[model samples]
Target: TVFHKRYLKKIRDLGEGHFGKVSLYCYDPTNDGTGEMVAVKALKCGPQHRSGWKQEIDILRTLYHEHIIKYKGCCEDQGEKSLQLVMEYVPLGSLRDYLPRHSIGLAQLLLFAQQICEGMAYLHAQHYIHRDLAARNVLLDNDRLVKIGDFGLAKAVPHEYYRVREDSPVFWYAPECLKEYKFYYASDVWSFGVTLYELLTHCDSSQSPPTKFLELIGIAQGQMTVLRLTELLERGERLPRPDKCPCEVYHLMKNCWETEASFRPTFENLIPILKTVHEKYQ
Candidate 1:
């Protein structure tokens, strides 16, 4: 159905991408005869749209969680221009926006990480993997609750055609992921580890980012690489673990980002670890 402008007013443009545009639309469903305010993603099936759209739709249809953004509805205006994804409005915007505005406290970072793990746990249980998990893909609701967004790169794994060598976002890719293009649920755990690194150190914001930790080692660009996190086995600067970091949580992050996939803990194991960190730190 074409959106009725009688109740909906375009408030602001949220984002633009190859698929289409995202806009913040103001409407009060009860008061304004519509239903509620929403974010509308206008997507066009261009010549290349066939590539990833179906994967995204299938993935989103299977996900439901407090930490995952709710997809309200969708409309396809095949003749008009594009398909539209109607979703819950997140007033606080992406984590990328939230990060630069304020230094996230350790407590906040831990909470967010816990939530990410919970969401990933749910996805992994369903045998799906969020291949593009990253800080930018996380959105915040009006209450500052973190909600995972952007399902464009999600994939159901271990299928006959499922190969591990698919390309992924450079900064967030795990060492094994780069090499094999094969990503397991553990790969998402690895990216979350780097994301935690970003939360802790503002490593991504630095003029000289942490890319050197992998690059200077001559690790191939698209292969799973390795880094030593302990003080005694340093190839470069020690990955920072601040005093404010709860020992359990810091060590857990180290384990999550470990080079060996078998060594990493499942998200299921994170709940107790997070609980301890919260209990001890708070």
Candidate 2:
């Protein structure tokens, strides 16, 4: 379904995407006050990178899941090859933003983790790898349901893995990913582990991954070195427990942070494990 710009009323800036600038809008044919809210991602400036934008559109349009963000369609102009991409406006934004301001129960956080794994499993099944899986990218609907948004770094992996020339947020990355410069399914699992840590820490900036990593390694803020981090991880060093992180959950994350990618659990395997572990916390 193609969304016409005429029916989409401009609201305000939402955020930026890998391919375009995202903004909030009101979608109503009639200029009534009760227009449905939607997020619109529009491309601007240079268009040399249109294929990447097309890939994102192609990848998003076909994905349908309770835990993944909903794609509502797009509005392309007559002469343009690519145009505005539309999606459901998730009110709660992201865990990075929500967790700090609110104090939620542990049981609720497990549910969020379960939902994320579910969404991730679905994406993996569809042959896509989310290279940028993190708390800031995970959205929450009004029901507090976890929705995997921001598919900017998502790629359809025909083979097992791919080397990226693109830049990324390294805080949540697996040591192998940073060391070998290659991304695999297990790489995402490692990021999920970091996300779980963020959940347990209530996303406090003081306890953030990079900050914590630097603190534990005794490296000052601006002096972080990949080689040192790689060596430390190879020596079995890891992030310490958070204030209230349950032993089971911390160990579960440890499984994800394994040095060998093959040692990490697949998203498919994480589902039943999460459900089973989540029961006790609930």
Candidate 3:
């Protein structure tokens, strides 16, 4: 059904990004009735962002898993040539925001990790690759159930390899992705490991306004460069294991960062390990 302006009552601005803005809305079936809360992301109208919006909608419509965000529906503003995606209102916001305010115990960390693995595993089984996977992309509901969202960077793969030249979040990428612009299921495993580090340390992995390749290329010859950071990573540098991190967990993170993509564990292989760690924490 086409959504009319009268159907949604804007409550507050949730956030904004390159594509558009997300706002909290009250879905009122009738003008006189109380409404249920929902979140709507309105995409900017332009050729540049239209493909991204379309891709997200295509993937979301085909996906149905508990750990994945539920896509309620979509609407179009013909006059503005824009689109709006209606999604389940996850009240707790993103895992990135949650980690900073709350003290997470071992069990909580394991739970988060396991759920993430399960979500990614499901996506992979569906022949989709979440090119970008991070704590910020993971949302929580009222009960703090982890739900993977933000499919703007996601792609459906027909083969084992996918090529991409666009610059992504550098810190989360596997060395193969950074050096050769190749992405695959293992590349996502590398990102999952980075997310694990973020959860354990409660620290931001990349510097603010994150160092992209274009910026590094323009730097003066003598200036300290972000390229050096990537160089270290290419040479096997990895995020330091957190002080309180269990050795088993740290080892798993290391395995995910293996320079050889084939060396990384698949999500199927990760679940049992995560479960074992959670049992120990219990």
Choose the strongest candidate by TM-score.
Answer: 2
| Candidate 1 lDDT trough over 10 residues, lowest sum | 227-236
The C-alpha stretches of model 3 lying farther than 4 A from their native spots are: 142-144, 203-227
- The Cα local distance difference test for each model comes to 0.67, 0.86, 0.79
Q: Compute the lDDT of residue 189 as modeled in candidate 2.
A: 97
Ranking by TM-score: 2, 3, 1
Q: lDDT tens string, model 3, 1-282?
A: 455666888889987643667789888877765766888887866685788777888888899998998888887766567668888888888878877787877787778889899999999999999987888888876443698978877887897978975537776888777777888899999999988887787544342123333344445653533455557677776667776888888999999989889989999999998888888896
lDDT of 2 by residue, 1-282 (tens): 888777878889988777678899899887786878999887665554587777888899999999999998888855456677899998788899999999988988988999999999999999899988889888989545889998878888887997876347777888877788889999999999999999989889999988887776665545556667777888998888888888988999999999999999999999998888778888
For residues 1-282, what per-residue lDDT tens digits would candidate 1 score against the true structure? 345545566789998533456798876545654667788776655565655665566677667899998877665645555456778898888776777787766777777777777888888888888877777777866433688888777777765223654334755665666655667778788778766666665334551124545444445533433333222223223345744666666678788777767788888998677766755655
> Clashes in candidate 3: how many?
0
Model 1's TM-score against the true structure = 0.79
Please give the RMSD to the true structure for each candidate, in Å.
Answer: 4.9, 2.1, 3.4
Q: Where does candidate 3 have its weakest 10-residue lDDT segment?
A: 205-214
